[PDB]
Design a protein around this ligand. Structure first.
Ligand SMILES: COc1cccc([C@@H](C)NC(=O)[C@H]2CC[C@H](c3ccncc3)CC2)c1
Ligand SMILES: COc1cccc([C@@H](C)NC(=O)[C@H]2CC[C@H](c3ccncc3)CC2)c1
Ligand SMILES: [Cl-]
Lengths: 374, 389
């Protein structure tokens, strides 16, 4: 009764490794790993599969899958897959779907990063983090269905407008609160850049792409400790990147730009001397102060002693918004969109399986527990 | 919504292969089959086990297990295990626990029979079938916790009393209704005998041991398997196992013929010193069936036995149970067919405690799977066995 009530609660919990969706993943994965003619020479395997042949087919039909979605356009490419703008066929609702190749993750020794990515987007319950509605999988891919962000990213905005300081104040303030939310969850991002800052239908920021997230105990935006470490470091390394972001928005170039990557690496390490505001750049004293406060050695960097000292910096003083209502004021640039599939703010994009194994190799074991239904 | 409601129903259903207990069995079995040092040289396996190390330990603690029961006495022994009279420690309630060796089942190519046995005892919801409260498993055994029949079996009764025909009428009538219940569930028993007929606290029959149960076809027929203990097997069941013969519910009615003969006469109708002698007498039943001249038996009782102990084609119970029920032998002043189990039994057991096993005869180390070199899947056969009432 009491031991049964504890076991039933462990299964009910959406955070649990033994939720109902995880246990089904265990069954599916096992059937996929076992159902090959050479393995069925084992009586244990063949009998097991005969028993679970029909019911696993019936689950595969009932469960969510890629064929439930029409692909409209490819809106991203990454190391292990792509991002598809999709419409779910039944509901007719539009999402951004991220695909991850199982073969490549196993081939390139990188098949754990997606857990924190899934958890952040699923469970943050935060307006600064892209919401995940569904995670599911086939034999070839992991899928992550997310709220579509039709405003596009800060790279797109920056190339389309000269950003005045009133706007930069706003976007930097929204990045500060997004990072504070990530940090509050016990997480360092490690890859803060405009590419990973997206604007919703109302022109307000959310963070996406949590592939480099780690739970706490491109070279333009990397901090000098992260350069010297080559693998310890803390939340302060994200605050470096906000320093670089604000510089990029106001100046229009990266502060440690060079023709080669080695030139950039060498400038970043020499930041005390190489940080230099151009004499033609329209930038205030307070804005130079904040950038300089972020672009220092880790030991004395702004945000080391919490977010509060970032919030009371004079740069962020203004007549338009407060910190506790910023996301409910009018954004600088409302996207003008023609439809629920308008991907005009995203640039156009242009483009092997596991072998049939001789014995059990367990290629699906890494992905057991990935399925999540909101 | 609708596709989600179908998936949620499949999981809710206690009959389903993908109930919550089955899915947990899948996880446990997988961990047990994979957690060996040589297999963890695979990164997929090692990482998987690291992820599920703590939670599987926590499930093993929470789930029902053999250490939740005190073993009081061994009351049975069988091909693949034994029977323990047990007391559950927390509730203090007494059950009969049947164990089944996983090693032996795999070693001796026989690891499917327990499914129908588990299902019959769990789901029959019938006073003629022993109730199963819990099925669980460890790495070595399947366990089946059922209600304890402190009256013991009809072998025990027959050796302790000269059975008069009024008693034989009663026990045979209770067997007829038990078999009719099994047959109504789409099942042939194939091994009906006194050993498998137990008496509850009130001295009334229930069938136990469903290891030779088969599910019938849409034409009421069944495929060959298993036999041992030849005394009660029918001649079609003898002829079939040589070849690939077919047989139906009528083969259980042969066994009731043999039962009633044993109760009234006191010996088996086809007895011999060797098993081959018994087999030869059963096949020659037209000539070998002979009532001894000193046997106290009625004309009606000889009629019923003879009606059962014939060729399948003309055997009683071929055309349903009703013609068995209207046979004059079963006429009496004490019970009707619809209230038999609620009248006073011939022999109510007087028992001195909840652990009194006086109606069960006294009974007096094991080997495990080797540490495998690769994945062999020894636990895959037993996924879905766990049932909590
Ligand atoms: C590691 O293998 C990858 C495969 C594909 C993409 C990516 C990485 C670089 N890309 C991403 O994470 C996108 C995902 C879609 C997000 C989005 C949400 C809502 N609207 C528009 C975009 C924006 C980040 C990595
Ligand atoms: C095939 O591997 C076997 C392993 C152990 C036992 C058996 C066979 C011979 N034995 C059985 O089925 C028993 C089970 C307990 C029942 C019971 C119920 C309630 N009270 C007392 C006993 C009586 C039948 C077979
Ligand atoms: Cl009657």
């Amino acid at each position: 009764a009491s031991r049964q009530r504890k076991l039933e609660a462990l299964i009910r919990d959406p955070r649990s490794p033994i939720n109902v969706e995880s246990l089904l993943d265990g069954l599916n994965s096992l059937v996929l790993d076992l159902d090959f003619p050479a393995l069925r020479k084992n009586k244990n395997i063949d009998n097991f599969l005969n028993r679970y042949e029909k019911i696993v087919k019936k689950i595969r039909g009932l469960q969510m899958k890629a064929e439930d979605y029409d692909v409209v356009k490819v809106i991203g490419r990454g190391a292990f897959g792509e991002v598809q703008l999709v419409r779910h066929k039944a509901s007719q609702k539009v999402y951004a779907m991220k695909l991850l190749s199982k073969f490549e993750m196993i081939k390139r020794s990188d098949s754990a990063f997606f857990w924190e990515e899934r958890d952040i987007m699923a469970f943050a319950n935060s307006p600064w983090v892209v919401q995940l509605f569904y995670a599911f999988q086939d034999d070839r891919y992991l899928y992550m269905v997310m709220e579509y962000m039709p405003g596009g990213d800060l790279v797109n905005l920056m190339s389309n407008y000269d950003v005045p300081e009133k706007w930069a104040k706003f976007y930097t303030a929204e990045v500060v609160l997004a990072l504070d939310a990530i940090h509050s969850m016990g997480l360092i991002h490690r890859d803060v850049k405009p590419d990973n800052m997206l604007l919703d239908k109302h022109g307000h920021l959310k963070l996406a792409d949590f592939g480099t997230c780690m739970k706490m105990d491109t070279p333009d935006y990397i901090s000098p400790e992260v350069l010297k470490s080559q693998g310890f470091y803390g939340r302060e390394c994200d605050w470096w990147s906000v320093g670089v972001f604000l510089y990029e928005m106001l100046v229009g170039d990266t502060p440690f730009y060079a023709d080669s990557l080695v030139g950039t690496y060498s400038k970043i390490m020499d930041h005390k001397n190489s940080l230099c505001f151009p004499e033609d750049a329209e930038i205030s004293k307070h804005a130079k102060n904040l950038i300089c406060a972020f672009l220092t050695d880790r030991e004395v960097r702004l945000g080391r002693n919490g977010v509060e000292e970032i919030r009371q910096h004079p740069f962020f003083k203004n007549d338009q918004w407060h910190w506790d209502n910023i996301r409910e004021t009018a954004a600088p640039v409302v996207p003008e969109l023609s439809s629920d599939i308008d991907s005009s703010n995203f640039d156009d994009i242009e483009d092997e399986t596991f072998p049939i194994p001789k014995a059990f190799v367990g290629n699906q074991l890494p992905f057991i527990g990935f399925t999540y239904y909101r």
